[PDB]
Design an enzyme around this catalytic site. Sequence first.
Site, PDB file in Angstrom:
ATOM      1  N   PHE A  63     -89.058  21.672 -67.944  1.00  0.00           N
ATOM      2  CA  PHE A  63     -89.809  23.276 -67.911  1.00  0.00           C
ATOM      3  C   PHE A  63     -89.953  23.645 -69.253  1.00  0.00           C
ATOM      4  O   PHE A  63     -90.354  24.822 -69.415  1.00  0.00           O
ATOM      5  CB  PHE A  63     -88.626  24.360 -66.874  1.00  0.00           C
ATOM      6  CG  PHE A  63     -88.473  24.089 -65.783  1.00  0.00           C
ATOM      7  CD1 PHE A  63     -89.731  23.106 -65.076  1.00  0.00           C
ATOM      8  CD2 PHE A  63     -87.217  24.653 -64.740  1.00  0.00           C
ATOM      9  CE1 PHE A  63     -89.253  23.177 -62.953  1.00  0.00           C
ATOM     10  CE2 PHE A  63     -87.486  24.678 -63.653  1.00  0.00           C
ATOM     11  CZ  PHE A  63     -87.832  24.027 -62.519  1.00  0.00           C
ATOM     12  N   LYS A  64     -89.532  22.564 -70.034  1.00  0.00           N
ATOM     13  CA  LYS A  64     -89.498  23.138 -71.112  1.00  0.00           C
ATOM     14  C   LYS A  64     -89.413  24.791 -71.874  1.00  0.00           C
ATOM     15  O   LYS A  64     -90.274  25.032 -72.453  1.00  0.00           O
ATOM     16  CB  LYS A  64     -91.336  22.703 -71.853  1.00  0.00           C
ATOM     17  CG  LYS A  64     -91.832  20.963 -71.795  1.00  0.00           C
ATOM     18  CD  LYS A  64     -93.170  20.972 -72.182  1.00  0.00           C
ATOM     19  CE  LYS A  64     -93.499  19.582 -72.229  1.00  0.00           C
ATOM     20  NZ  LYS A  64     -93.037  18.812 -70.604  1.00  0.00           N
ATOM     21  N   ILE A  68     -87.100  33.482 -74.749  1.00  0.00           N
ATOM     22  CA  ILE A  68     -85.753  33.974 -75.986  1.00  0.00           C
ATOM     23  C   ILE A  68     -84.210  33.880 -75.024  1.00  0.00           C
ATOM     24  O   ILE A  68     -84.527  33.421 -73.870  1.00  0.00           O
ATOM     25  CB  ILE A  68     -85.871  35.646 -75.513  1.00  0.00           C
ATOM     26  CG1 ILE A  68     -85.224  36.228 -74.234  1.00  0.00           C
ATOM     27  CG2 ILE A  68     -87.075  36.438 -76.569  1.00  0.00           C
ATOM     28  CD1 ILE A  68     -85.118  37.876 -74.713  1.00  0.00           C
ATOM     29  N   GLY A 173     -95.209   9.457 -72.483  1.00  0.00           N
ATOM     30  CA  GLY A 173     -96.979   9.066 -73.347  1.00  0.00           C
ATOM     31  C   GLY A 173     -97.288   8.056 -73.140  1.00  0.00           C
ATOM     32  O   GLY A 173     -98.239   7.610 -73.862  1.00  0.00           O
ATOM     33  N   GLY A 182     -92.787  -1.484 -73.832  1.00  0.00           N
ATOM     34  CA  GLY A 182     -92.287  -2.016 -74.108  1.00  0.00           C
ATOM     35  C   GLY A 182     -91.980  -1.539 -75.883  1.00  0.00           C
ATOM     36  O   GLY A 182     -90.380  -1.137 -76.283  1.00  0.00           O
TER      37      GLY A 182
END
Lengths: 218, 218
Positions: A63-64, A68, A173, A182
Amino acid sequence: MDVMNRLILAMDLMNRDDALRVTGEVREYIDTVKIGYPLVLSEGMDIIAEFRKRFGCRIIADFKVADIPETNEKICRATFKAGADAIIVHGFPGADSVRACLNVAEEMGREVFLLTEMSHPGAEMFIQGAADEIARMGVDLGVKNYVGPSVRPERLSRLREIIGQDSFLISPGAGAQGGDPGETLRFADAIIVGRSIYLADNPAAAAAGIIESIKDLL
Amino acid sequence: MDVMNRLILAMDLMNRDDALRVTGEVREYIDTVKIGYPLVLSEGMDIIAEFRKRFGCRIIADFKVADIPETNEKICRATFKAGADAIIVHGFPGADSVRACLNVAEEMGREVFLLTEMSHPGAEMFIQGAADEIARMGVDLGVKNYVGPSVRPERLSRLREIIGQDSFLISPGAGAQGGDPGETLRFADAIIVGRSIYLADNPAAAAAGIIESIKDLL
Ligand SMILES: O=c1cc(O)n([C@@H]2O[C@H](COP(=O)(O)O)[C@@H](O)[C@H]2O)c(=O)[nH]1
Ligand SMILES: O=c1cc(O)n([C@@H]2O[C@H](COP(=O)(O)O)[C@@H](O)[C@H]2O)c(=O)[nH]1
């Protein structure tokens, strides 16, 4: 956290049927699924319970969290109440916002992952320059779980240096964004993979192939 | 957008019955509601439609979008599909992530708000140092709507300077976080207010009181 095959599925399909189908197809290879807002906003927080019912996989809510402290606490509560095992929180908004998540996680017996540097090119603009300090901040706060970018192994290596060998590090990524599984696992404990699996004509074969490519690291 | 009484309700109650009651009670004073993850994760994205059905209010989805471009696109799509008029996006992940949101918003005829500096103490660690550049990046990208902090008037002023008088600027932090409605409206077009209204014994009276205090700025 013990992630099967060092592989976490990023389930970013936005249809409940497709998400459940593709996850079912790769269930033999993974026991950890990262569910983010694409799926949750399309199908509801009940999707977490649905995954647990069907697969029993650990669920990382990606949920990144980047609000606040007061709002972060509410987000974490809603998320853990829905059955998430862990939540991913941005470090950029600073220590208090992270602590707010740590507090809820501590109270409910769940985990927080601190996202330090992101994998996309835009990360170079502001995040990268702050990433080492964000990681150190995580260390100061007693954060044990971290997220860093597969596509920059030198940065992933630095992150691992900062957090030490005892911290848990997962890394997106790999695959679609150009990261190598790897090489990434030289530094990260587990890789996150989304499109390379869930957009594959045969997701099971895609998962199997990735695992085959890293078999010596397992 | 034309925000009634320059006042946007931050509806962060997590119970549908309470959220609807309070919003309905203040609807005579406010035609723009900010709905964030606390309510959405508790009640579902269907809450947006419910607000539209019950009230004549614009909905700003405060989702602080902060992912890679590809994921940001999906989030914006799911959010606009649900009937949100606008979405709030973090600038710190950089220009590509923001551009991704702007693309969906342009395609769907909706608005993006760029969150520059945040209002909590932790914002000083990393966000504040980047905020001027984030704002300037917003300007370069053609962003027209911005969010900046009520609690640091000097910073809110700088933000307004960067984006110009023609840009639309809204600001949280008034009330519970210590910001002042009047001072904030010297720079912001509208103030966001949550707890000062929704935790009041009489939310309508609380909203009316705030509006009364800024009557001359209307
Ligand atoms: O730096 C980061 C942090 C992420 O959580 N992610 C997430 O990891 C997943 C990557 O998916 P993919 O393998 O299709 O690139 C997505 O859910 C994305 O939002 C990322 O790509 N980069
Ligand atoms: O910098 C920011 C950006 C925000 O969106 N917010 C949001 O604005 C609202 C402020 O609520 P309150 O008036 O109860 O402090 C919350 O929904 C919060 O998540 C903030 O407080 N500071």
